[PDB]
Amino acid sequence: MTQKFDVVVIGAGPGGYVAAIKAAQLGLKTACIEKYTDAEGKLALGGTCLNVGCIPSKALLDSSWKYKEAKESFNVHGISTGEVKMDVAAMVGRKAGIVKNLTGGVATLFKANGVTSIQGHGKLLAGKKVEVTKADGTTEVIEAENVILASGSRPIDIPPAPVDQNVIVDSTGALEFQAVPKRLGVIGAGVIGLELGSVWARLGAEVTVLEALDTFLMAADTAVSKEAQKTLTKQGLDIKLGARVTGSKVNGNEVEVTYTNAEGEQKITFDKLIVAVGRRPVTTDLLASDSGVTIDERGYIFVDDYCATSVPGVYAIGDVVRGMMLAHKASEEGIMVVERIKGHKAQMNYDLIPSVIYTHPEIAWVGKTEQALKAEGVEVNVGTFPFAASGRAMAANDTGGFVKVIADAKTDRVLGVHVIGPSAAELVQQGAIAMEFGTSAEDLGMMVFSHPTLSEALHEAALAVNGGAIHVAN
Amino acid sequence: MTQKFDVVVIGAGPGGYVAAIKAAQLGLKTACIEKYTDAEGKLALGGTCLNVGCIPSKALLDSSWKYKEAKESFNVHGISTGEVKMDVAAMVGRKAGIVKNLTGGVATLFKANGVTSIQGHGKLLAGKKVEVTKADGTTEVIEAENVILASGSRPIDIPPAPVDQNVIVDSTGALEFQAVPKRLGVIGAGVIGLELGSVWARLGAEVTVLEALDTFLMAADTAVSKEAQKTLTKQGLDIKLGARVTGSKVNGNEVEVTYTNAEGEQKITFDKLIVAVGRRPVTTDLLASDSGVTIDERGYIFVDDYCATSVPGVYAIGDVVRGMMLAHKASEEGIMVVERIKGHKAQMNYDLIPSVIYTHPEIAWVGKTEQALKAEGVEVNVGTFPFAASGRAMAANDTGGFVKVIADAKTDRVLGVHVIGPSAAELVQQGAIAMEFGTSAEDLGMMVFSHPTLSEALHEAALAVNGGAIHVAN
Ligand SMILES: Cc1cc2nc3c(=O)[nH]c(=O)nc-3n(C[C@H](O)[C@H](O)[C@H](O)COP(=O)(O)OP(=O)(O)OC[C@H]3O[C@@H](n4cnc5c(N)ncnc54)[C@H](O)[C@@H]3O)c2cc1C
Ligand SMILES: Cc1cc2nc3c(=O)[nH]c(=O)nc-3n(C[C@H](O)[C@H](O)[C@H](O)COP(=O)(O)OP(=O)(O)OC[C@H]3O[C@@H](n4cnc5c(N)ncnc54)[C@H](O)[C@@H]3O)c2cc1C
């Protein structure tokens, strides 16, 4: 009595669970396999994003920001408090409650949509056959007409500082500290390192970020990255570029890190060290030798522009394949794939995928950067508006940053929108929507924007493109 | 000899100052007359919006919210404080600084754009001639080829409770209290009353809102207004509908208000009473008897759909004319008018002017309401998404409210977007931009939205229109 499904999804992350639900919505008998469990051995959907990634980081970022603001920015509004203290265990407990509630909601969506969730390790055998390994080493083989490989990724482990889930930890561990470490070191100045570094810095940690690369957020706009580094150094993140870690020595509750930069070989001791150099795609026991699915030199599963593998009916989405390792990317690929299975001539749009960094000020952008377009030989018009001139921002006592719009000098078509400041993610989305309809700098500048709102910064930025802004001289 | 200008603008509010700057940008020798002065008799640009309206209210709203959150919502994040106290004088002092900074900036924009600002009372004589009355009763006449009347509005004064800038105050006075009134009464449950009522309620006042009308925000969507009333009553605003004020008696530092509702005649005593039933258009000494500009039964200056009066070359914009009394409305009318003067084929679109109520949760919308479209005989498709399911919102500890999208059942064209919750104004602007390009519910549902962000609620709402949402059952 072999079980049979129309679609089998291996993995329950932003790519996997969305796909499963979407397949069920289209009448496909879907099953979603997942090995990840909560702290009591029970199934936990939502992947990295929900369990040890996106949500958790945002929870601690919001709580840690409310503490920093209460200590320094409350006086200005006339608000006094006594001493302001943070109980880390309770901060982390609030986060756990949020995660537990959200994971339970995905399970609710699965039941309501009719998705059969299976708890175990899934492996793709030959002939779209899937082997599920139960907790007690028992094996069951299930039949699938379509398979969606969505195993995501894991953190990179570096030889000089191997993680030991105690003094040296990865992103997952850095979300579990039960006390603020006096001295915190972070390897990797990327999005993850900066968010995790910001949290503990706000709570009193002496944070040092050792980045081996000579650049800082090179993917972002030169102006946005120059501002982020300046603002983040003020917040207590001692960001050191061109610093390569060569070794570490754990001693009791301390670790002495050894690195090399332009000046020579230095040493620094931390109470806790977070390794966050990047993430590698996961395919551990995911494929049988004769499954027919090819892996690439860097660990990613080969797929075409539609996330289809060599094998008919076998697709691979999210972090385990090429592209930006973002949750919304994975999700959209999941939807694109399911529609393709149902026969739609679907293809998602990779050109307008925004990126968001949840530091404070928030950073986000969509489209091309100014420096990438100078190298591409495109003459552009640049308009910017600082939040220092936004009335809404002044009311909120959060005036740092700006909005930058980039248009083509000949057509006036908006080629990119970049923001660093309050509600940056929302302003960038407004830009993305406009660009989707192929907006010009003029088109946005002619629209009616609410007053007073943070959205106006995008409006003044668009007008400033062609030197027609009202709230900043041209 | 006699001074000559291409454009003369009477009034320096959101309609007036924007128009002046915009006229200067297009090479028109512009002059802007303004009688309003700061507390030291010196010119103060920005009108009601900047001096005693928009900006000031937002400042106190943001500060008062930070106090409420610190008292009740901090323990959840693990943050403990001593006693939390608000120094009202400092709260109001921060606001004054913001206003002073912004008013100075408009003056800076005028100088930089080459606008001649004149400090005095302007009056439109016959033949596009403008009479300026200086502080010492001296009179000067200036010549104009075009005149833009932008005298705005003032608060309604009611006979049963005449304002005395002490116990009984209007919006302007309610922004100047130097102590939290123990018992605060508010006449009018409109946008202004709710924002002013919310501020002092959060600071410990016992607030009662007497609304004569049987409805509550009837201009908003039925769902948005039903939710706002529920949430605002929980926050301490005792909103009483069908309660008409018949008289008041001031006695020392108290006022006994007398009203009539369905139950009979009641009495209640307040320490401070804010009159906020609405606003009337201002035309005091604005027109000479033979200027040729017609006034309406309710005080508004007659204009066509392009803000042009009967007199050639005489335009009237903002609150002094028909339409929603909003700053961004006035501004856009100012721009529309200036472009028409320069000969451009300009024409406003009044259907896509969003409205924003800055209470917490924030309320905003653009386009038509569900109830207005049922009466209009338009078959619609409705999609909604609650913030209780937004991961970003849970992280922020602010889950109340929802996003509601309305599309035409045949074309799928988005006819309206309504929001009550976090970043409501920004999500609605995203909708406005989409509608400007004539979006369908499907168009938005197919875009890539960042995760996790509040913008996703607009995304799930758009998908839910045609029953394709992922995070809420269909
Ligand atoms: C601290 C942190 C913060 C982040 N913040 C953001 C953010 O703000 N925004 C953003 O867009 N991205 C963020 N990311 C990245 C985001 O987590 C990933 O892009 C996203 O989770 C990828 O989704 P996925 O479903 O492809 O893989 P995952 O979410 O990793 O899901 C893969 C799942 O597959 C399971 N699995 C793997 N192999 C098997 C098997 N053989 N059998 C059964 N199950 C298997 C795993 O247990 C896992 O649960 C963050 C990451 C981290 C670490
Ligand atoms: C408490 C409060 C909060 C508000 N909040 C908001 C909000 O959040 N968002 C929003 O969109 N709107 C808000 N409004 C409404 C908004 O303030 C007005 O719609 C806005 O000011 C636009 O008005 P205007 O430019 O047409 O004229 P106004 O801004 O009213 O200014 C007109 C100017 O003309 C001057 N004037 C009149 N006659 C003469 C004359 N003869 N000579 C010289 N000068 C003259 C006046 O002194 C005044 O400065 C709020 C109002 C109040 C009271």
Side-chain angles (χ1 to χ4, degrees), chain A residues 380-408:
Chain A
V380 289
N381 283 328
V382 177
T384 62
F385 185 84
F387 289 107
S390 170
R392 189 72 196 79
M394 292 173 184
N397 187 27
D398 188 18
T399 61
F402 57 88
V403 175
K404 175 173 172 173
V405 173
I406 312 176
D408 188 59

PDB file of all heavy atoms in Angstrom, chain A residues 380-408:
ATOM      1  N   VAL A 380      22.616  58.504 -16.277  1.00  0.00           N
ATOM      2  CA  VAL A 380      21.489  58.601 -15.333  1.00  0.00           C
ATOM      3  C   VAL A 380      21.298  59.957 -14.677  1.00  0.00           C
ATOM      4  O   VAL A 380      22.221  60.768 -14.620  1.00  0.00           O
ATOM      5  CB  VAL A 380      21.638  57.586 -14.172  1.00  0.00           C
ATOM      6  CG1 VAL A 380      21.415  56.168 -14.659  1.00  0.00           C
ATOM      7  CG2 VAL A 380      22.994  57.733 -13.476  1.00  0.00           C
ATOM      8  N   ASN A 381      20.076  60.163 -14.182  1.00  0.00           N
ATOM      9  CA  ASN A 381      19.690  61.354 -13.437  1.00  0.00           C
ATOM     10  C   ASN A 381      19.383  60.887 -12.012  1.00  0.00           C
ATOM     11  O   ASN A 381      18.617  59.930 -11.804  1.00  0.00           O
ATOM     12  CB  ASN A 381      18.478  62.055 -14.054  1.00  0.00           C
ATOM     13  CG  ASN A 381      18.822  62.865 -15.296  1.00  0.00           C
ATOM     14  OD1 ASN A 381      19.919  63.420 -15.426  1.00  0.00           O
ATOM     15  ND2 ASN A 381      17.852  62.985 -16.191  1.00  0.00           N
ATOM     16  N   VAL A 382      19.990  61.578 -11.044  1.00  0.00           N
ATOM     17  CA  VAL A 382      19.869  61.243  -9.626  1.00  0.00           C
ATOM     18  C   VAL A 382      19.177  62.324  -8.801  1.00  0.00           C
ATOM     19  O   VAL A 382      19.581  63.480  -8.821  1.00  0.00           O
ATOM     20  CB  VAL A 382      21.267  60.994  -9.020  1.00  0.00           C
ATOM     21  CG1 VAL A 382      21.175  60.709  -7.522  1.00  0.00           C
ATOM     22  CG2 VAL A 382      21.961  59.852  -9.750  1.00  0.00           C
ATOM     23  N   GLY A 383      18.137  61.912  -8.073  1.00  0.00           N
ATOM     24  CA  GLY A 383      17.378  62.797  -7.173  1.00  0.00           C
ATOM     25  C   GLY A 383      17.367  62.187  -5.771  1.00  0.00           C
ATOM     26  O   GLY A 383      17.158  60.978  -5.617  1.00  0.00           O
ATOM     27  N   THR A 384      17.625  63.012  -4.757  1.00  0.00           N
ATOM     28  CA  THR A 384      17.626  62.538  -3.374  1.00  0.00           C
ATOM     29  C   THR A 384      16.859  63.487  -2.462  1.00  0.00           C
ATOM     30  O   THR A 384      16.713  64.673  -2.756  1.00  0.00           O
ATOM     31  CB  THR A 384      19.054  62.375  -2.802  1.00  0.00           C
ATOM     32  OG1 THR A 384      19.716  63.641  -2.798  1.00  0.00           O
ATOM     33  CG2 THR A 384      19.872  61.374  -3.621  1.00  0.00           C
ATOM     34  N   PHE A 385      16.351  62.938  -1.364  1.00  0.00           N
ATOM     35  CA  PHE A 385      15.634  63.727  -0.363  1.00  0.00           C
ATOM     36  C   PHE A 385      16.007  63.179   1.013  1.00  0.00           C
ATOM     37  O   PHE A 385      15.808  61.983   1.288  1.00  0.00           O
ATOM     38  CB  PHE A 385      14.132  63.670  -0.580  1.00  0.00           C
ATOM     39  CG  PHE A 385      13.342  64.559   0.351  1.00  0.00           C
ATOM     40  CD1 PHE A 385      13.154  65.908   0.062  1.00  0.00           C
ATOM     41  CD2 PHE A 385      12.772  64.047   1.514  1.00  0.00           C
ATOM     42  CE1 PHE A 385      12.411  66.723   0.911  1.00  0.00           C
ATOM     43  CE2 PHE A 385      12.044  64.855   2.364  1.00  0.00           C
ATOM     44  CZ  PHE A 385      11.858  66.190   2.055  1.00  0.00           C
ATOM     45  N   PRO A 386      16.569  64.045   1.874  1.00  0.00           N
ATOM     46  CA  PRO A 386      16.959  63.593   3.195  1.00  0.00           C
ATOM     47  C   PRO A 386      15.788  63.634   4.150  1.00  0.00           C
ATOM     48  O   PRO A 386      14.911  64.488   4.014  1.00  0.00           O
ATOM     49  CB  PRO A 386      18.013  64.620   3.604  1.00  0.00           C
ATOM     50  CG  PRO A 386      17.565  65.890   2.942  1.00  0.00           C
ATOM     51  CD  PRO A 386      16.846  65.490   1.682  1.00  0.00           C
ATOM     52  N   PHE A 387      15.758  62.722   5.111  1.00  0.00           N
ATOM     53  CA  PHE A 387      14.683  62.724   6.105  1.00  0.00           C
ATOM     54  C   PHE A 387      14.818  63.899   7.066  1.00  0.00           C
ATOM     55  O   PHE A 387      13.876  64.225   7.771  1.00  0.00           O
ATOM     56  CB  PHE A 387      14.600  61.396   6.849  1.00  0.00           C
ATOM     57  CG  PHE A 387      14.085  60.294   6.013  1.00  0.00           C
ATOM     58  CD1 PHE A 387      14.916  59.306   5.544  1.00  0.00           C
ATOM     59  CD2 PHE A 387      12.739  60.235   5.701  1.00  0.00           C
ATOM     60  CE1 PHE A 387      14.419  58.279   4.764  1.00  0.00           C
ATOM     61  CE2 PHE A 387      12.237  59.206   4.925  1.00  0.00           C
ATOM     62  CZ  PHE A 387      13.082  58.228   4.458  1.00  0.00           C
ATOM     63  N   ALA A 388      15.982  64.539   7.070  1.00  0.00           N
ATOM     64  CA  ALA A 388      16.207  65.731   7.892  1.00  0.00           C
ATOM     65  C   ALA A 388      15.249  66.873   7.512  1.00  0.00           C
ATOM     66  O   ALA A 388      15.063  67.799   8.287  1.00  0.00           O
ATOM     67  CB  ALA A 388      17.646  66.198   7.751  1.00  0.00           C
ATOM     68  N   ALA A 389      14.662  66.802   6.322  1.00  0.00           N
ATOM     69  CA  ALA A 389      13.711  67.813   5.864  1.00  0.00           C
ATOM     70  C   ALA A 389      12.253  67.306   5.894  1.00  0.00           C
ATOM     71  O   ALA A 389      11.352  68.027   5.473  1.00  0.00           O
ATOM     72  CB  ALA A 389      14.078  68.281   4.457  1.00  0.00           C
ATOM     73  N   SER A 390      12.030  66.087   6.384  1.00  0.00           N
ATOM     74  CA  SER A 390      10.681  65.534   6.449  1.00  0.00           C
ATOM     75  C   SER A 390      10.032  65.915   7.747  1.00  0.00           C
ATOM     76  O   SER A 390      10.549  65.597   8.804  1.00  0.00           O
ATOM     77  CB  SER A 390      10.715  63.997   6.358  1.00  0.00           C
ATOM     78  OG  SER A 390       9.438  63.436   6.649  1.00  0.00           O
ATOM     79  N   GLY A 391       8.898  66.588   7.671  1.00  0.00           N
ATOM     80  CA  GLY A 391       8.152  66.980   8.868  1.00  0.00           C
ATOM     81  C   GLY A 391       7.696  65.771   9.679  1.00  0.00           C
ATOM     82  O   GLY A 391       7.778  65.778  10.909  1.00  0.00           O
ATOM     83  N   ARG A 392       7.232  64.735   8.988  1.00  0.00           N
ATOM     84  CA  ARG A 392       6.774  63.518   9.658  1.00  0.00           C
ATOM     85  C   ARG A 392       7.906  62.881  10.414  1.00  0.00           C
ATOM     86  O   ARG A 392       7.708  62.386  11.521  1.00  0.00           O
ATOM     87  CB  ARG A 392       6.251  62.488   8.657  1.00  0.00           C
ATOM     88  CG  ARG A 392       5.567  61.285   9.304  1.00  0.00           C
ATOM     89  CD  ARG A 392       4.220  61.673   9.881  1.00  0.00           C
ATOM     90  NE  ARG A 392       3.703  60.687  10.806  1.00  0.00           N
ATOM     91  CZ  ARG A 392       4.107  60.565  12.061  1.00  0.00           C
ATOM     92  NH1 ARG A 392       5.080  61.341  12.535  1.00  0.00           N
ATOM     93  NH2 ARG A 392       3.562  59.638  12.832  1.00  0.00           N
ATOM     94  N   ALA A 393       9.096  62.877   9.806  1.00  0.00           N
ATOM     95  CA  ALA A 393      10.257  62.289  10.451  1.00  0.00           C
ATOM     96  C   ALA A 393      10.668  63.074  11.691  1.00  0.00           C
ATOM     97  O   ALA A 393      11.052  62.482  12.693  1.00  0.00           O
ATOM     98  CB  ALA A 393      11.404  62.177   9.474  1.00  0.00           C
ATOM     99  N   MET A 394      10.573  64.401  11.639  1.00  0.00           N
ATOM    100  CA  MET A 394      10.933  65.223  12.793  1.00  0.00           C
ATOM    101  C   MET A 394      10.001  64.950  13.947  1.00  0.00           C
ATOM    102  O   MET A 394      10.443  64.878  15.098  1.00  0.00           O
ATOM    103  CB  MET A 394      10.892  66.712  12.453  1.00  0.00           C
ATOM    104  CG  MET A 394      11.952  67.185  11.481  1.00  0.00           C
ATOM    105  SD  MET A 394      11.598  68.896  11.072  1.00  0.00           S
ATOM    106  CE  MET A 394      12.856  69.220   9.852  1.00  0.00           C
ATOM    107  N   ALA A 395       8.713  64.783  13.641  1.00  0.00           N
ATOM    108  CA  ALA A 395       7.715  64.483  14.674  1.00  0.00           C
ATOM    109  C   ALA A 395       8.060  63.201  15.408  1.00  0.00           C
ATOM    110  O   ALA A 395       7.900  63.112  16.605  1.00  0.00           O
ATOM    111  CB  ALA A 395       6.336  64.361  14.056  1.00  0.00           C
ATOM    112  N   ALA A 396       8.564  62.234  14.665  1.00  0.00           N
ATOM    113  CA  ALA A 396       8.934  60.920  15.200  1.00  0.00           C
ATOM    114  C   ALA A 396      10.283  60.887  15.882  1.00  0.00           C
ATOM    115  O   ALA A 396      10.622  59.871  16.492  1.00  0.00           O
ATOM    116  CB  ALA A 396       8.933  59.897  14.067  1.00  0.00           C
ATOM    117  N   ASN A 397      11.040  61.982  15.739  1.00  0.00           N
ATOM    118  CA  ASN A 397      12.409  62.134  16.273  1.00  0.00           C
ATOM    119  C   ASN A 397      13.348  61.116  15.635  1.00  0.00           C
ATOM    120  O   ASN A 397      14.252  60.586  16.286  1.00  0.00           O
ATOM    121  CB  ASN A 397      12.477  62.046  17.799  1.00  0.00           C
ATOM    122  CG  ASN A 397      13.868  62.380  18.355  1.00  0.00           C
ATOM    123  OD1 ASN A 397      14.626  63.116  17.743  1.00  0.00           O
ATOM    124  ND2 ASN A 397      14.202  61.832  19.504  1.00  0.00           N
ATOM    125  N   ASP A 398      13.157  60.867  14.348  1.00  0.00           N
ATOM    126  CA  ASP A 398      14.003  59.926  13.623  1.00  0.00           C
ATOM    127  C   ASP A 398      14.234  60.483  12.222  1.00  0.00           C
ATOM    128  O   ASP A 398      13.615  60.060  11.267  1.00  0.00           O
ATOM    129  CB  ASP A 398      13.334  58.545  13.603  1.00  0.00           C
ATOM    130  CG  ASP A 398      14.235  57.472  13.051  1.00  0.00           C
ATOM    131  OD1 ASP A 398      15.474  57.683  13.003  1.00  0.00           O
ATOM    132  OD2 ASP A 398      13.701  56.400  12.683  1.00  0.00           O
ATOM    133  N   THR A 399      15.152  61.436  12.127  1.00  0.00           N
ATOM    134  CA  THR A 399      15.444  62.144  10.882  1.00  0.00           C
ATOM    135  C   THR A 399      16.630  61.655  10.043  1.00  0.00           C
ATOM    136  O   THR A 399      16.841  62.171   8.946  1.00  0.00           O
ATOM    137  CB  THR A 399      15.678  63.646  11.197  1.00  0.00           C
ATOM    138  OG1 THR A 399      16.795  63.809  12.096  1.00  0.00           O
ATOM    139  CG2 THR A 399      14.437  64.253  11.821  1.00  0.00           C
ATOM    140  N   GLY A 400      17.396  60.678  10.522  1.00  0.00           N
ATOM    141  CA  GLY A 400      18.549  60.211   9.755  1.00  0.00           C
ATOM    142  C   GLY A 400      18.217  59.458   8.471  1.00  0.00           C
ATOM    143  O   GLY A 400      17.188  58.751   8.383  1.00  0.00           O
ATOM    144  N   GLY A 401      19.081  59.627   7.469  1.00  0.00           N
ATOM    145  CA  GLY A 401      18.944  58.933   6.198  1.00  0.00           C
ATOM    146  C   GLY A 401      18.370  59.727   5.050  1.00  0.00           C
ATOM    147  O   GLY A 401      18.137  60.917   5.169  1.00  0.00           O
ATOM    148  N   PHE A 402      18.118  59.035   3.940  1.00  0.00           N
ATOM    149  CA  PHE A 402      17.582  59.653   2.727  1.00  0.00           C
ATOM    150  C   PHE A 402      16.933  58.640   1.775  1.00  0.00           C
ATOM    151  O   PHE A 402      16.990  57.430   1.976  1.00  0.00           O
ATOM    152  CB  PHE A 402      18.720  60.363   1.981  1.00  0.00           C
ATOM    153  CG  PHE A 402      19.867  59.445   1.620  1.00  0.00           C
ATOM    154  CD1 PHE A 402      19.863  58.737   0.420  1.00  0.00           C
ATOM    155  CD2 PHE A 402      20.939  59.261   2.494  1.00  0.00           C
ATOM    156  CE1 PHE A 402      20.913  57.878   0.093  1.00  0.00           C
ATOM    157  CE2 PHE A 402      21.985  58.407   2.174  1.00  0.00           C
ATOM    158  CZ  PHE A 402      21.978  57.718   0.971  1.00  0.00           C
ATOM    159  N   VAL A 403      16.303  59.175   0.740  1.00  0.00           N
ATOM    160  CA  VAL A 403      15.700  58.391  -0.319  1.00  0.00           C
ATOM    161  C   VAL A 403      16.425  58.833  -1.590  1.00  0.00           C
ATOM    162  O   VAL A 403      16.609  60.028  -1.823  1.00  0.00           O
ATOM    163  CB  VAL A 403      14.207  58.662  -0.484  1.00  0.00           C
ATOM    164  CG1 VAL A 403      13.670  57.897  -1.679  1.00  0.00           C
ATOM    165  CG2 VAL A 403      13.455  58.286   0.778  1.00  0.00           C
ATOM    166  N   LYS A 404      16.848  57.860  -2.390  1.00  0.00           N
ATOM    167  CA  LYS A 404      17.555  58.122  -3.631  1.00  0.00           C
ATOM    168  C   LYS A 404      16.873  57.398  -4.799  1.00  0.00           C
ATOM    169  O   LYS A 404      16.710  56.176  -4.769  1.00  0.00           O
ATOM    170  CB  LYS A 404      19.006  57.675  -3.483  1.00  0.00           C
ATOM    171  CG  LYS A 404      19.869  57.780  -4.736  1.00  0.00           C
ATOM    172  CD  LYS A 404      21.318  57.470  -4.404  1.00  0.00           C
ATOM    173  CE  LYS A 404      22.173  57.375  -5.650  1.00  0.00           C
ATOM    174  NZ  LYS A 404      23.615  57.242  -5.307  1.00  0.00           N
ATOM    175  N   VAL A 405      16.462  58.189  -5.795  1.00  0.00           N
ATOM    176  CA  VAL A 405      15.829  57.692  -7.010  1.00  0.00           C
ATOM    177  C   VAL A 405      16.796  57.890  -8.181  1.00  0.00           C
ATOM    178  O   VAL A 405      17.464  58.955  -8.305  1.00  0.00           O
ATOM    179  CB  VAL A 405      14.510  58.437  -7.283  1.00  0.00           C
ATOM    180  CG1 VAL A 405      13.920  58.058  -8.641  1.00  0.00           C
ATOM    181  CG2 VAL A 405      13.518  58.147  -6.170  1.00  0.00           C
ATOM    182  N   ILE A 406      16.865  56.861  -9.032  1.00  0.00           N
ATOM    183  CA  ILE A 406      17.746  56.865 -10.219  1.00  0.00           C
ATOM    184  C   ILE A 406      16.919  56.624 -11.486  1.00  0.00           C
ATOM    185  O   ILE A 406      16.193  55.627 -11.582  1.00  0.00           O
ATOM    186  CB  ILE A 406      18.827  55.752 -10.139  1.00  0.00           C
ATOM    187  CG1 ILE A 406      19.533  55.758  -8.776  1.00  0.00           C
ATOM    188  CG2 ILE A 406      19.839  55.914 -11.278  1.00  0.00           C
ATOM    189  CD1 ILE A 406      20.530  54.633  -8.589  1.00  0.00           C
ATOM    190  N   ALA A 407      17.040  57.534 -12.449  1.00  0.00           N
ATOM    191  CA  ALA A 407      16.320  57.411 -13.718  1.00  0.00           C
ATOM    192  C   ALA A 407      17.281  57.531 -14.879  1.00  0.00           C
ATOM    193  O   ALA A 407      18.370  58.065 -14.717  1.00  0.00           O
ATOM    194  CB  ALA A 407      15.222  58.467 -13.824  1.00  0.00           C
ATOM    195  N   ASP A 408      16.859  57.027 -16.039  1.00  0.00           N
ATOM    196  CA  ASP A 408      17.648  57.074 -17.269  1.00  0.00           C
ATOM    197  C   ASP A 408      17.587  58.508 -17.822  1.00  0.00           C
ATOM    198  O   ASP A 408      16.505  59.071 -17.959  1.00  0.00           O
ATOM    199  CB  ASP A 408      17.080  56.098 -18.303  1.00  0.00           C
ATOM    200  CG  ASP A 408      17.977  55.951 -19.535  1.00  0.00           C
ATOM    201  OD1 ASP A 408      19.149  55.549 -19.386  1.00  0.00           O
ATOM    202  OD2 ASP A 408      17.497  56.197 -20.659  1.00  0.00           O
TER     203      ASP A 408
END
